[PDB]
Design a protein around this ligand. Sequence first.
Ligand SMILES: Nc1ncnc2c1ncn2[C@@H]1O[C@H](COP(=O)(O)OP(=O)(O)OP(O)(O)=S)[C@@H](O)[C@H]1O
Ligand SMILES: Nc1ncnc2c1ncn2[C@@H]1O[C@H](COP(=O)(O)OP(=O)(O)OP(O)(O)=S)[C@@H](O)[C@H]1O
Ligand SMILES: [Mg+2]
Ligand SMILES: [Mg+2]
Ligand SMILES: [Mg+2]
Ligand SMILES: [Mg+2]
Lengths: 351, 352, 358, 359
Amino acid sequence: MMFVHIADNHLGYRQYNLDDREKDIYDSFKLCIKKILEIKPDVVLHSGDLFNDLRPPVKALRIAMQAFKKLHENNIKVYIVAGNHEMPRRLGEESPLALLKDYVKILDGKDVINVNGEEIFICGTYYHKKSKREEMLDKLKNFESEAKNYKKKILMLHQGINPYIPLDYELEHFDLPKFSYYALGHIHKRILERFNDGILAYSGSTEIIYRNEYEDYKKEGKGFYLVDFSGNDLDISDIEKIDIECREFVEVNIKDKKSFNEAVNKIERCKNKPVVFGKIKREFKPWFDTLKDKILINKAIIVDDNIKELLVDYANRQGIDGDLVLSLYKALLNNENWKELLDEYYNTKFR
Amino acid sequence: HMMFVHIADNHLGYRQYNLDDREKDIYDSFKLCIKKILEIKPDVVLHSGDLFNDLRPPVKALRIAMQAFKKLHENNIKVYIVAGNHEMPRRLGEESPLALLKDYVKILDGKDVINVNGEEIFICGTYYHKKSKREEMLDKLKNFESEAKNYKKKILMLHQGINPYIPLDYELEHFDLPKFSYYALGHIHKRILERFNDGILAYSGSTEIIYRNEYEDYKKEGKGFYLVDFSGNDLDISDIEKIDIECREFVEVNIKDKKSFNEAVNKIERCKNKPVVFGKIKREFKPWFDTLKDKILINKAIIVDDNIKELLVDYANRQGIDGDLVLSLYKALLNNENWKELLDEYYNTKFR
Amino acid sequence: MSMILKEIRMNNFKSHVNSRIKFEKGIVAIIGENGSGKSSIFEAVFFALFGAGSNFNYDTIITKGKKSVYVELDFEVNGNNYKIIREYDSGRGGAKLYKNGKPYATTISAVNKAVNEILGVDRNMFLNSIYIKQGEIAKFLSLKPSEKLETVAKLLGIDEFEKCYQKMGEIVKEYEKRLERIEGELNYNLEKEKEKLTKFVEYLDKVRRIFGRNGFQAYLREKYVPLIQKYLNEAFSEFDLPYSFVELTKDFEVRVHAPNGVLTIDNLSGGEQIAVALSLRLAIANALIGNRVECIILDEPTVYLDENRRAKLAEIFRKVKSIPQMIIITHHRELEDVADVIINVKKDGNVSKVKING
Amino acid sequence: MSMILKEIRMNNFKSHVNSRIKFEKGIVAIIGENGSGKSSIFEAVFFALFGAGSNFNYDTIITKGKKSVYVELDFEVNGNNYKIIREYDSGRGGAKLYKNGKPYATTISAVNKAVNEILGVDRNMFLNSIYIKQGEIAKFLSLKPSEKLETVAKLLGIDEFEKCYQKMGEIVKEYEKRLERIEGEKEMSNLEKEKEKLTKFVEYLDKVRRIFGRNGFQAYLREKYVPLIQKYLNEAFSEFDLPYSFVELTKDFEVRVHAPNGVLTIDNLSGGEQIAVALSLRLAIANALIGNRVECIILDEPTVYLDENRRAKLAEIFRKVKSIPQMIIITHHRELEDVADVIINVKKDGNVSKVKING
DNA sequence: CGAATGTGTGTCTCAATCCCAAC
DNA sequence: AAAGTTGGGATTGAGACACACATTC
Ligand SMILES: Nc1ncnc2c1ncn2[C@@H]1O[C@H](COP(=O)(O)OP(=O)(O)OP(O)(O)=S)[C@@H](O)[C@H]1O
Ligand SMILES: Nc1ncnc2c1ncn2[C@@H]1O[C@H](COP(=O)(O)OP(=O)(O)OP(O)(O)=S)[C@@H](O)[C@H]1O
Ligand SMILES: [Mg+2]
Ligand SMILES: [Mg+2]
Ligand SMILES: [Mg+2]
Ligand SMILES: [Mg+2]
C-alpha cells in the first residue's frame, strides 16, 4: 500500500524564451512518469500546477495526456487538485485538466479507496485565493467531519501555509485539521516535516523554474515522493525521496582572475551541458568564448572594471546644524509654527 | 456491401460575433453529427479537414473533439483525417491539434488499404498544401496514382480548392486530379456533389453556418455530412444520401416599409430555433421591432436614418480653358519631354 | 505619495451611463473588448481630481444623448478619507470635496486648489507619474531634459524639499525685516547684540541653500542613481534580453550596453523601449519601497511586446511588492491570470456594464 | 503606379551583419521577437531610397561595432526593374541606381534626386502612404487639417497634379523671362503685335496653372473621390462588427461616426477603434484607385491596440483584399501568421539578426 | 454675461547637427 | 595622391506668441 506525491511540473514553461528550456521540462516530466511506471504505485497524488498556463501548447497537452493514459492503463488511480495556474479565470473557458478527466480524478471533495482490504480516505480541493479563505475553511471543516471514522486519511491542497511561505500564504497552520499526510503544492521548495500527528509534505517542483531553485537542486534533488502507507500510521522513515535529473546551472561572479579557474572544472564535472549565469568581467569574456560549445547558454553580465538621516549628514558636511535643518524640515511641511521654533534658536544656541 | 461517412469543415471553436451562443452552436451541431454517426454504424469515417477553427483552439473544443473520436474508435470505426488550412502548424516545434486524436484517428499523409466485408479499398490523402507548393502536391498525387492502379475501388482525401468550383481562392485545377472512385474534399462550405472523371467528386459542406455567405447554400442544400454506399463495383449519386443536421436559423429582413414588417414577425415566429436577424431597418421602424429581442438570439441589423482623364478636360473647359491643352500639357510635364516644343506650337498655331 | 483609490461612481460619463466600480489593493485588472469602456473609467477619475479643461471638453465627456455628467470618487492618502464630487447640470457646474465625512471645499476652483496640495502633483505632472495612458509608457523617458528631471523630482519624492525652499524665502525675508527694523534706522557693549541678529539671518540663507535645487536635492538625487540602476537591471534582466547592463546617468538618460557597442533608447525597438520604461518605473518604485508607497495606473502596457515578453512581464508584476495598488488595462490574457481582482467590462447598446470579480 | 518590392541585401545594417531577403507578391508576414530585427529590414528599404539624414545618423544605422554599411535593393514600379546600391566605407559614401540592368545615377545626390522622380513621393509622404510605421496607422486621420489633405493627396494619386502646379510655375515664370528678353529691345512696329500676343498668353498660362492647383482641380477631384471611398469605408468597417449606424467621411477627410443617439469623432473613439477606421480607410482608398495607383503597402504591427477578436476579423479582411498587389505586414502576434501567404521568420543570435524564410 | 484661465495649436524662429560634395 | 577641411542643404529641437476653444468667477 504505497502512493506517490508529485506536484509543480509547470509543463509549457519556456524559460529564457529558449526552446531547449521548454523541452527540458517535458523530459523531466516524462522521466517522472517513467520512474512512476517502473515503481507501479497504488495511487498517484498530483497536488497541482501540472501545466504552466491555462491555455498550454498542443504539445504539452499531448505529452500530459499520453502520460496519464499510461498510468490509468496500469490500474494506477491518479488524484489531482487544480493549481493556481489551472483555475479558469474567465467564464466559458475550461481548465486544461479537463482533458484528463477519464484517466485522473480531479479532487474537489471526498473519496475512499480499498487497498488490499483497507479503507483509506483521500480528500482535496483546488487553489483558493487568499480572498476566499472563509469558503476554504468551510471546505476543510467538512472534510474533518467526514473523516473521524477513518484512521488513515490524506489531504491534497494547492495552497501556501503561513510558517513555510511567508510572502504569499493563503492559509494559516492552525486551520489544517488532523490528517496522516498532507499532499501540498504551489511552493517549489521541497519540504518534509511532521504536523499534527502526521506528515506535511511539499513535493516541490520537477524542473528548475525560477532561478532561486538551483541552490536547492545541488542540496535537495528535485522529483517526487514515494510514501509507504502500509502500516497504520506514518513517519518520516517510510518516505523515500525520488530525485530526477535536471539541467545543470553554473554560477560565476567573475570579478577576479581566480574566478576564471572555477569554471572549466565545474562545467565539465556536471551531468549535462550547463547554463552559466551571473557576472563576468569584460576583460575575461573573449578568453571565455573557447568553451561556449560545452555550455548551453551564457546569461552572464559583462561588467566593466533613510533620507532623514542623510539630510543631517549633508548639513553638517556643509557646516550647518543638521538637527535644526531636520526639525525645521518638519515644522513647515507639517505646517507647524516655525515662528515659535525659530525665535528660540537665535537666543540660546547661536554664535 | 459497405458504407462510410464523409464529413468536413466543422470549425470547432469558431466564436462568431464573439458570442457564446454561436460558439456552442458549433459544438452542438458537431456533437449531433457524432450522435447521428453513432446511430448509423458506418465502417469508416472520412474527415477531410478543418475539424478545428484555429491552431490553438480552446480547451473545450479540444475536449469535445476528443470525446467524439474516442466514441468512434471504441466502436471499431476507423476514422481517417487530413489536416486542414486552419490546422497546419505555422511554426516548427509546435504541434497541430489533431495530434491529440492520434489514438482514435489515422491522420492521412500517404496510402492505406482496408479490408471491409471482403474487398480491398484504396484510401490516400495529404495535408493542406498552400498555393506555393503545388508541384510538391502534384508530386504527391502522381505518387498516389502509381500505387492505386491495382485497386478497382479507390478514394482520395484532399483539403484544397479546385478551379471549376471556387474561382476566388482555388489551389488546384481539375486536370491535376487523377481518376479515383470518390473524392472526399473540403475547405469550401458550399455542399457540392457532382460526377467527375468516371467517378464522384464531393465537397462535404460545413456543419454550422460559419461565414455569412453560406446561408445562400444552406437553404438550398442542407448542411451536414454524406453517407456513401460503396457496395457496387462503381459509384453513382443514387447510393449517396446526404444527412442534414439542424443549424441556427438566420432571418433576413429589409424592413423599410410596413409591408416588409409582416415579413419579419411571421417568419421570426415560423422558424425552428431563436433566429438571427440582419440587414437594414429604418430608424422609425426599429424601436417597434425591438419588442422581439426576446424571441431572437442576436440582432445584427443596421439602423438607417431616413476615369480622371475625362473629368480634367471637362473641368478645364468648364472654367473656360482649352482642356485639350491642359491635358496634353499635363502629359508633357509628367514625362521628361519638351514642354517648350509643345507650348511653342500652341502659342504660334492654335492661340488667339 | 501614499496614494490609494477606493471607489468611483459615474453618471452619463462618455459610454458609462451609470456604473459604480470598487477598487482593491493589489493587481487590479480591467479587461474588455475595444471601445468597451476600459480607458473611459480613468478619464473619469482624472475628471474628478481636475475639472474639465479645454482639452477635457464637456461635449467630449457627455454621453452623446444626455446633457449632464456626475461623478464621485473615494480615495485615501496619508491616512485620510476623501470624497470628490463633480457635476454639470444644464450649463452650470459645481463640485464638492469631503474629507472624512464633513466637506472641505465647495467650489470647482476650490476643489482643484485643494487637490493639487493634498497630492503635491498638478494636472500635467499627474499624467507622467500615476496615470500612464496608451503608448505614453515611454513618454516619461523621452521628456525634455528640464521636464525629465522635473517629473523625476516628484517620482523620487525630492519635490517636497522645494516646498521648503520656497517657504524659506517667506521665512528668510520676514526675519530680514526684523533686521531692517535696526538697519533702516542705524544711520541718518550692547552693540554686540546688534551683530547677533545679523549673523543669524545670514545663517538662514545657507539653510535655504541646503533645501535648494543644487544643494541637497541634487545631492540626494545623485546618491539615488546607483540604487535605481541596480533595480533597473534586476527587472530589465527578467526580459532575458541580450544586453550587458543598463547604465543610468545622473540626468536620468538611459544607456544600454551591448557587447560590441553602446545603444540608446532611440535605437532600441518599440518593444525594448517599453521593456526599459517599465523596468525603470519599477526601479523607481523599488528604490523607495517604503518611503513613497504610491499607486500606479497603466493603460495597455504589454502592447508592442511579443508573447514571451508579455508573459515575463506578468511574473515581474507578481513579485513586485513595492506598489500597494497597481491597476492595469489590457486586451491580453497574459495579465488576467496574475491579477487578484479582475474587473470585466462589456458594452450592450453603446452603454458599458461593469462586472466585478473578487 | 505599379510598385512592387522584389529583394534586398544588407551588410552591417544595425543588427543585420549580413542578410539577404526576397519578397513575394501577397500577404507577407514578418515575425520575430522584440528586437529580433523586423523593423530594421524596412529601415534599410528607407535607407536605399533616401540617403541618411541628419537625424538618420550613420552612427545610428551602422552596426555599433562595425565601420561600414552596404545595402542593395531590387524593386519594380510601373513595370520596370530597378536596383539601388548604397554604401559607406569608412567616412565616404556612394550610391548607385540601375534600371533594368544598366546604371542611371552614380552619385548619392544624383540617386536621391532620381528616386524622387520615379516614386513621386519625397521623404515625408513615403512614411504616410506606403511605409506606415508603428501607431501611425491612425495618426494620418487625427493629423493637422492642412497636413491631413496634404497626405490624402499622395495616397489618392492627386499629388501628381501638385507636381504639375509647381512645374507649371517654371513655365509661367520662364515665359515671363522671354518678355524681359524682348522688353529691353525706316523700319518699325511689328512688335506691337507681340505685346498683346505674349502677355495675354502669360495670363493664360497662369490661368491654366490655377487649374492644376490644390483648390482648383485637386480639391474638385478629391470631392468626386469621397462618395466611392465612403461606401468602401463602411463595407470594410462593418467587418469589425462595431455598434454604429454608418461611417461618414467629410470632403475634408475628417471622419464622423453615426451612433444611434449621437455622432462621434476620432477624438472620442478608443485607440483600437481609431486603428479600425484607419485601416478600413486606407483599404477604401486602395479599393478606389484599383488601377490608377496600384501601389504596394507596408504595415508595422497594425493589430496592436486591437483585442483578440478584432485581430482575427482583421485577418479575414486582409484575405479578401484584392486591390493591393503586395502588402507586407510585421507582427508580434500569431493572429496574422495563419492568414499570410509567405512567412519570413526573423530570429536573433545574441545581437545579430538571422532570417529563415519559408516559402 | 465678459474676463481670467490654462490648454492646445499653428507657426515662426535661432541654433545645432550631420550628411554630401568639393579643394 | 592623399588626407582632413569646409560650406550647401535638411531636418530637428527648444523658445515665442497671437489666435482660439471652453471652462469657470
Ligand atoms: N460622449 C460620448 N458618448 C457616448 N459614447 C462615447 C462618448 N465618447 C466616447 N464614447 C465611446 O466610449 C468608448 C471609449 O471607451 P474606451 O475606454 O476608450 O475604450 P477601451 O475599451 O478603453 O479601449 P482602449 O482601452 O481605449 S484601446 C468608445 O466606444 C466611444 O465611442
Ligand atoms: N547601430 C546599431 N548597431 C547594432 N544593433 C543595433 C543598432 N541600432 C539598433 N540595433 C538593434 O537592432 C535591433 C533591431 O530591432 P528593430 O529594428 O526595432 O526590429 P524589431 O524589433 O524586430 O521590430 P519592431 O517593430 O521594432 S518590434 C534592436 O534590438 C536594436 O537594439
Ligand atoms: Mg502554484
Ligand atoms: Mg508553482
Ligand atoms: Mg478551410
Ligand atoms: Mg473551412
